[PDB]
Every structure is written in C-alpha cells, then in structure tokens.
Amino acid sequence: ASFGSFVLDAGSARFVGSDELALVLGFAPGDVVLTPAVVLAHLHPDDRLEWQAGLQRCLATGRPVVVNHLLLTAEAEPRPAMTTLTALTEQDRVRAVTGVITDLSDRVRRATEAEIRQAVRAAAATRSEIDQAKGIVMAAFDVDADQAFALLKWHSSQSNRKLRDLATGMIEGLAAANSALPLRRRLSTVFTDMGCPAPSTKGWTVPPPTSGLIPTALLPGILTRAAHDASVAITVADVTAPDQPLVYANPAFERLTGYAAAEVLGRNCRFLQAESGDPHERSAIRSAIANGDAVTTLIRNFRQDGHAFWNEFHLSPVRNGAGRVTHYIGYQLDVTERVERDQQLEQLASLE
Amino acid sequence: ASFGSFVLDAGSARFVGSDELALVLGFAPGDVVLTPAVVLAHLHPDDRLEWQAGLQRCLATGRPVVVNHLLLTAEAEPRPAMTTLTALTRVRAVTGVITDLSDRVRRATEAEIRQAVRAAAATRSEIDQAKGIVMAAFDVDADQAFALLKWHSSQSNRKLRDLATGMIEGLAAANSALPLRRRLSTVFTDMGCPAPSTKGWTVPVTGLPPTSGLIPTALLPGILTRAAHDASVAITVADVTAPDQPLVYANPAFERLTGYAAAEVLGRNCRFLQAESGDPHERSAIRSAIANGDAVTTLIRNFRQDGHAFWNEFHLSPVRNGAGRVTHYIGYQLDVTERVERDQQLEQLASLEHHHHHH
Ligand SMILES: Cc1cc2nc3c(=O)[nH]c(=O)nc-3n(C[C@H](O)[C@H](O)[C@H](O)COP(=O)(O)O)c2cc1C
Ligand SMILES: Cc1cc2nc3c(=O)[nH]c(=O)nc-3n(C[C@H](O)[C@H](O)[C@H](O)COP(=O)(O)O)c2cc1C
C-alpha cells in the first residue's frame, strides 16, 4: 500500500510486478499483469519521459537512479511519489533492474495559513493596478473591458510609459484631479497631463398647428416665463440688424457661458469663441444663416472665464406675417461628455 | 534528488558505500570510511531499531523494504529521509538507497503556496476591477466604491469576492440601452441587494423678474412659440382655471420624454405619469403648492406610456395675469434618473457614516 516493487531482466525484458505495486497503483494484486506501460499510465505525463530515461540509464550505466514523480488516482488528487532503481551487473553488464515505487504522501508537509497569507499579501503589495484602471475606463466611457484595455495600451504608447506605470499614474492623477469637472473630461486631462495628445477640437454643421386651448391674450406672459425658466440655453438674434446681434438670452445661457444676459445684447454670438474660432466652421454657419435653413452645429467654445466646452447649438429660422425670415433662435447645449466618449470610440475605430 | 547507495555482502558483512552516500551524510568521500555503524550514527536514535530490522529483514526475506527516518545534521535540524533496500538473489547482498527528502518536501510546500497565491491574485484582480467600475460609474472615490462593494456584499449575504464576480458578469450581460447607473443598480438588485428607494420630495424655489429682452413685442408670440417648440427639454402648461387643472400645452421634448403625443394628453391632468402609483403624501404636497400659487421643484417616480420608469424632477412655475391671479402653471420635466441613482448610493454611505459616528 505504501510502496511496491518490480524487476526487469535486461535480456528478455521480463517485468515482474509485486502485489504491493498493484496496491500502490490502485489495483488488486491479481487483476492485471503489471507492465511498464501500466506503470507509466499511472504517472503524470510530465514524469513519463524522465521515469523512462531513469530506467534506461540504470540499464546502461548500472548506477542507481532516483526519480521524483506523481501517482495519478482515478478520482482523487495526485500523490507525491518516488522511484528508486538499482541494477545487478554481471561481467560489467546489467542483467536486471529492480525498482521500488514509494508513496510520499505521509512525508508531505502542508503550508500553514500564516505563510500563505504572508505570500499572498506580498504579491498583493507588488501587483500592477491595471485591473482597477481597466474598471475605471470601462465604466467612465461605458465601454467593455476589451475596449477599455485597448485604450490603456494606446495611451501608454503616446506617453511612452509602462502599461502599469500608466495605470498608477492615471489612478492617482484622477484622484488629485478637480472633482468639479465631469468625469470623462477629468480623465482626458489626466491623460494629457501625462504626455498624451490633447483631444481634437474639430466640429461640424448639419441641417405647430396650435391647439387653441391657451387664450391669445395670456400667451405672451406664459411663453416669456417659459423661456426664462427653461433649464437649457435659449437665445434670439435679429438677423435683420447690423452684425446679427443678440436680442435675447435666458438665465440658462448665462449659467452655461458665464456672460450676463444684459451685457450680451447687441453683439453677435461669435464672442463665445474668444479669438479661436476656426475659419472654415464660421463659413458654414454664416452660409447657413444667410440661406434661411435650419441647421445644427458642433463647435468648441469658452465661457467668460477660460473654461472650454463642446457646444452643439441648433439654429431655427422664424418667419413673420409676411413670410420673411427675420430672426433666428439658438439652442446651446454643453455636450462635452458625449463628445469625449465619442472621441475614444473614434480612437478605437482608428485601431482597425 | 540527493541520494546515496550502498551494497552489503551477506556472508562477510562487507559494506561498500558510494561517494554520494558520504556526501549525503555530510562528508567528502575521502574524509570518512563508510560502514553500517556510520550510517546509523547519522540516523535519529528512534529510527535505528527500525532501520536495523529492515536491513536484517531484507537479508533473510529477500523482499524489498522501505524505512522512513531522519538524517542528523551537525548544528542544524535533521532532514527527512527514506532508505530503500533490495536484495540480490539466497541473499547474496543487499543494495541500499538512502534518499534525502529535504528538497522534495520543501518544493512541494512552495508549490502549494504558489498555487494559493495565484488563486488570491485572481480574486484580487476582480475586486480591483469591480472597485474601478463602481468608482467611475457612480463617480465616487476608491474608498467609497470599496465601501459600497462591502455594503452590497452584506445586503446580499455574499462574500465580497463573489459579489465582485457577480457584478462584472452581470453588468457585461446587462442591456446596453439602459444608462450605466440604472444598468448597474439592477445588477445589484438582481443579485439580492434590496431595491432602491422610491420616495421623492417637493421643495420651494429660492432670482430676478422675467423679461423678453429686445424681441419686438409683435414678433414675440411667434418667436417664443417656436422657442418652446424646439427646446430640447420638456415644457408643459396647465390651466388651473379649468376643472382638474388640465394640460393645455406640451412640446415635443415632452413627447419624447414620456412617450405621449400632445394630442392624447391635452385636456387631462398630468397625474397620468404616476400610473395610479402616486404616493398620497407626495401628491398632497404638490396640490398644496399649486393651490397656494407657490413655485416648487418636485422629484417623483414616473412612467412613460410604455410603462418604463424614470425619476422626474419637474419645476412648477406659476403664471399670474394682469390682476395678479394665477391662471396657468408651467412644468419643466427632467429625467434625472442617473443623478438620482448616484445620490442613492451616496445616501447609503452617508447613512453608514452617521451610524458609525452616533450608533
Ligand atoms: C441665434 C444664434 C445663436 C448662436 N449661438 C452661437 C453659439 O452659442 N456659439 C457659437 O460659437 N456661435 C453661435 N452663433 C454663430 C455666430 O453668432 C456667428 O453668426 C457665426 O459664428 C459666424 O461668425 P462670423 O460672422 O464671425 O463668421 C449663433 C448664431 C445665431 C444666429
Ligand atoms: C404644469 C404641471 C406639470 C405637472 N407635471 C407632472 C409630472 O410630470 N409628473 C407628475 O407626477 N405630476 C405632475 N404634475 C402634478 C399633477 O398633475 C397633479 O397636479 C398632482 O399630482 C396633484 O395631486 P392630485 O393628482 O392627487 O390632485 C404637474 C402639475 C402641473 C400643474
């Protein structure tokens, strides 16, 4: 049960296994004729080449051999085992080899809970925190793990930083970042603070019966109050006047842009661009307004302070009783977070 | 594998020990003459009797023998060892193989620990990933994210590592159409965490009077009618002079938000968004504010025409005619689900903090 024995004759290859050998392997003594192939069968496949070689060398050299290996069990886990081999030399020639397979299970020393905890914590102290960085990126841009992984690799190349170095830098960079900024824009600044290229700034320009249940007399006060209280920016420009000046700006516009409604009347809305308006973008807007068509524009803008943001503003033409388009309505929206995410997908697409 | 061998002639008791046997015991081959008495001197007293018997047994029987024992080390703890004895056939001599199991035993222990570390390293990576997912999904720091993972592990009676795996697998399988915070919240509840709260509130409004700027007063109705029509947020008007405060205006942004066409809601009170599930106290708060001509903001649970729910923060602004009579009310509905979902997670952490401070 603990150990078994066999003998092989060099000349005739006659293998005689003992009753104990079958028992150490998981057999009854008489069940099977014990053979070397059967012995190898109950060894872990990693042990079979060395075990065979150990025997062949004992036959060729006659010196004793010891092989460390496992013993497979049909149901249970493998047990540590050892095989010793010795030879009988007749006239400087090996006549037979006797082998002894022993079960080392009773000599195994198991790992204490303490040393395991020490080793696990040592590894946990030296780990790369990319898994956390992976989770932050996937959730921040609502992308999957693979996509989040791909982005982190790209960002490292641009920063010329180790992949793990990017993970730590991003995490402690995000932690010290300004919480008042939205997350996606916060993360992009963390990446640019580490040498990654700033995101692109290019934009684009693309193109009521009446219920009668409101008294005509009461409509102006109702509609005036509605524009005042609306949570999105509303503006009106007199396209008949010099330089298409603004004639209305609601409080939401002040909040969005930092310019007080009073101190903006009479001016063209270009001022939101500071002195950084792109010429090609201006031509698209100017051409749209002159043509009296309805259009939507994505553009970068700036508040009365330096704070930049993406602005998707829609332009609606309004006619008078004569059918002449005399005013335009502008609907400004801060769409920074959508654009930040969409730019990351552009980046992933570019990796095709 | 460090081992040594010997051969012992039966009749003459001649003992031939290998150079390797000398080294196993702790001597260069030339330093010592190898005799059976020398071998036993490096075994522990308690092994000597069993070892001698095994050697005598293999001689008489000729049957293989194995003896477990120690090897004594000068100024060091003994090493585990094992002797194998085979006879060369009567018994002409016995071949012995003394093996030092010190290395094999040490490596097996080291391997068990390595496998353990790999298991722990895997469980740490998933917790770290889930920690990061929570951090950015709800925009909270790592301690808060980790605290919420511990909280939701407690509420679902799960171990933190099992929760982490469930959240990652579940989120991956969630419906991509749901905005992330709603999506993740339903993953926690699908795993046994209790459902989020449903109770809202109603508060007053804490400005400057409205003006129409420099819009020509004649063009104002057309200009601002167009404005309310194209605005991206919902706008509704109710006539509080008519019975049951019916809806008299609703812009397309309201139609997108609720799934109701204006034609099919004009003339009805807005309560239909509550789907007959309005909290009695919340309704009374709204009624009282309206009856008093107050400006209030209300958070309430609502449902589109298709039944799907959303958190609605809608502001109520009274409109007074020339004589000062409130004739209409304006409502601005906003889907603030994602914000509310974050506030609720933050609310769970703040509730725990208060508990720790005051118990
Ligand atoms: C009602 C209205 C609102 C506008 N709002 C914005 C805006 O928010 N941001 C912006 O960059 N341009 C806006 N524009 C465009 C500018 O006012 C300007 O007409 C356009 O950029 C062309 O500028 P240019 O005359 O310098 O080429 C708006 C135009 C109108 C008519
Ligand atoms: C302009 C306006 C908009 C409203 N919008 C909503 C809404 O979107 N969701 C909601 O639950 N209640 C809304 N209400 C409140 C209900 O229509 C109703 O006044 C309230 O539930 C009163 O309680 P009762 O229905 O029990 O009388 C609104 C009220 C007004 C005047």
From TrEMBL, chain B:
Domain PAC: 296-348
Keywords tagged on the record: Chromophore, Flavoprotein, FMN, Nucleotide-binding
Sample GO molecular function, one term: RNA binding
Classification via PROSITE patterns: ANTAR (PS50921), PAC (PS50113), PAS (PS50112)
InterPro entries: ANTAR (IPR005561), CheY-like_superfamily (IPR011006), PAC (IPR001610), PAS (IPR000014), PAS-assoc_C (IPR000700), PAS-like_dom_sf (IPR035965), WH-like_DNA-bd_sf (IPR036388)
Chain positions recorded as FMN binding sites: N269, C270, R271, Q274, R283, R287, N302, N312, Q333
Domain of life: Bacteria
Sequence ranges assigned to domain ANTAR in this UniProt record: 107-168
SMART domains: ANTAR, PAC
Alphabetized Pfam families for the sequence: ANTAR, PAS_9
Residues of the PAS domain: 1-62, 224-293
Protein name: Putative PAS/PAC sensor protein
Native organism taxonomy: Bacteria, Bacillati, Actinomycetota, Actinomycetes, Nakamurellales
